[PDB]
Amino acid sequence: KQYPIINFTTAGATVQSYTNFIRAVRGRLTTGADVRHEIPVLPNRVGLPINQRFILVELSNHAELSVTLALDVTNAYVVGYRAGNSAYFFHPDNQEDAEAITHLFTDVQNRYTFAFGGNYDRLEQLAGNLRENIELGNGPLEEAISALYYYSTGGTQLPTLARSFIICIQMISEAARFQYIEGEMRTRIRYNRRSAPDPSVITLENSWGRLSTAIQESNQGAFASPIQLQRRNGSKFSVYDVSILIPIIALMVYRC
């Protein structure tokens, strides 16, 4: 009847409540995951039945406004959202994905597909701000939830909507994909801090597909060619194998 729902509120959010939330999100993403090896592999999109394809993340704030994000279990990424009686989707990359999203929010009166995709390069263009200048934390997420809701009423302009997607995607999708990024959000919540992600976080986000490829194509957990990541200060270093990454990457897109 309905896809699995995970609830989170910014209202009185704690390190523990955020941890419980990301744990529950990874739980629903990995129901059909390959968990035989050191790092979970999300299910292959090829031949995945439609009734296993999505999970719903219902977000609430101090204002008790609620939006529901749809996440694709094959890549943990946001494909669209519902606010009241309206649903909004990123432009699908192909006809199969366009058909898949017709199964989301089947109830809603108003369905809209954005002209644009949900990739960071495009969202940063629409927001007029790079990830390095968009603060993350409980405050940004509370504001993002209100902005996503008030898009449905005409109260939110597209640049603020795009900025709000950048906040939600990093604090939910990227936190689910990477223990390192979950921990970055735990630190911000603990200290009631709002701060932009440093180069270590941004390079990790940028590298998710490349890391999923290198790990799954590895010779007994040794890479064909090394992958470059960044330290907090932006200095580059090489990763030659999966070993150092098991604590850092929680979920991988199917590769082969």
Ligand SMILES: CCc1ccccc1-c1ccc(C(=O)O)s1
């Ligand atoms: C996420 C990048 C990463 C991957 C694997 C192992 C270590 C790292 C570092 C993050 C920050 C570092 C620093 O500031 O020195 S090093």
Ligand SMILES: [Cl-]
């Ligand atoms: Cl649709």
Ligand SMILES: [Cl-]
């Ligand atoms: Cl900027």
Ligand SMILES: [Cl-]
């Ligand atoms: Cl180091």
